[PDB]
């Protein structure tokens, strides 16, 4: 919906002793999960801002966490070179896949719910099986530290951004970089794709012409440390339009559930929501006293969450 965050906060959750790296929402429950730099993943009830529990399995700082479609498993990565899988019914680690040398930065479960992607400093992206834990295929082609990775809506296409200024889209079956993008002024840090409900809204936002099949094609977005947020086409690989105005380094980007606005956080201590179809909304909202690290938008509830380096997680209503 026209859900827009507002300057007043609801709860400023401060339980972490170390800077928070990422925050996500449970798919079904009224639960939000925050990973921080102290190797602990905390679980909160965002509706009332009540600390629920903590999972302290990880050795080094936890970097990225992700749920599945059903919300029954929680994939987590850390600097301890390992990927942990958490059973969310009882909240204990059930499978700790190793390998994938050096700090692991991002982890994600593609919607089929049977495999996991992982990216790390070792300049490659590994594929793991949830049931077994065997790395079955390894994606190479990034020449530098791969930062953030996200799959598609049906478990076939993957995007990997890295320090190497290139965003590469990979295919599950063929294991080939179908689209490689090298156009950013400085390092790309965060990526996120477009849901269904937004593709139509892109057509009049950019003027792109439909192909013979008529589908606009899958889409990307990439925010880069050069204070630029660029939204991209999977089928072609060409720029549609660019978002500029972020004061400092961008860290997190995602689309509004309605597929109409753009919500992004950056190291500019502020959260910016911007329109792209007609460039009307340019709302900047100070969020944290220090660097803001990550954010998330609830699929249905009018809530958003932001985790920052100040060891504090904040909740904003949407109006």
């Amino acid at each position: 919906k026209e859900w827009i965050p507002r300057p007043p906060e609801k709860y400023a959750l401060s339980g972490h002793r170390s800077p928070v790296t990422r925050v996500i929402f449970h798919p079904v429950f009224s639960v939000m999960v925050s990973a921080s730099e102290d190797a602990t993943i905390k679980v909160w009830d965002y509706e009332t801002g009540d600390f629920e529990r903590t999972l302290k399995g990880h050795t080094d700082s936890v970097q990225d966490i992700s749920f599945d479609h059903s919300g029954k498993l929680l994939a987590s990565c850390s600097a301890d070179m390992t990927i942990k899988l958490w059973d969310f019914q009882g909240f204990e680690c059930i499978r700790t896949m190793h390998g994938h040398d050096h700090n692991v930065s991002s982890v994600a479960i593609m919607p089929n719910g049977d495999h996991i992607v992982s990216a790390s400093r070792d300049k490659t992206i590994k594929m793991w099986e949830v049931q077994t834990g065997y790395c079955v295929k390894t994606f190479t082609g990034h020449r530098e530290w791969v930062r953030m990775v996200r799959p598609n809506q049906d478990g076939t296409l993957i995007a990997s951004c890295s320090n190497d200024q290139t965003v590469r889209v990979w295919v599950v079956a063929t294991k080939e970089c179908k689209a490689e993008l090298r156009e950013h002024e400085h390092v790309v840090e965060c990526i996120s794709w477009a849901p269904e409900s937004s593709y139509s809204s892109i057509s009049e936002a950019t003027g792109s012409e439909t192909k013979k099949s008529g589908k606009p094609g899958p889409f990307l977005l990439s925010g880069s440390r050069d204070k630029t947020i660029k939204m991209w086409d999977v089928s072609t690989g060409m720029c549609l339009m660019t978002l500029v105005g972020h004061d400092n380094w961008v860290r997190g980007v995602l689309f509004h559930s309605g597929g109409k606005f753009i919500l992004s956080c950056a190291d500019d201590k502020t959260l910016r929501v911007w329109d792209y179809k007609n460039k009307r909304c340019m709302k900047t909202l100070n969020a944290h006293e220090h660097f803001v690290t990550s954010l998330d938008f609830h699929k249905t509830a009018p809530y958003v969450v932001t985790g920052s380096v100040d060891q504090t997680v904040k909740v904003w209503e949407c109006r």
């Binding site: 302290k56 050795t59 080094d60």
Partner: protein, 48 residues
């Protein structure tokens, strides 16, 4: 838990040695400026 705490300790020690390297160059700069100042004062007395 033990591995976590040991890792934190190792990180603290590495940051310590890095700060020790910074302290050395700070001391070098301090020495250089002391030298220039004393030389200036000596030869100004020589002028006088």
């Amino acid at each position: 838990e033990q591995q976590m705490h040991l890792n934190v300790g190792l990180r603290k020690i590495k940051e310590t040695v890095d700060q020790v390297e910074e302290l050395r160059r700070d001391l070098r700069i301090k020495s250089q400026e002391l030298e220039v100042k004393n030389a200036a004062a000596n030869d100004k007395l020589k002028k006088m």
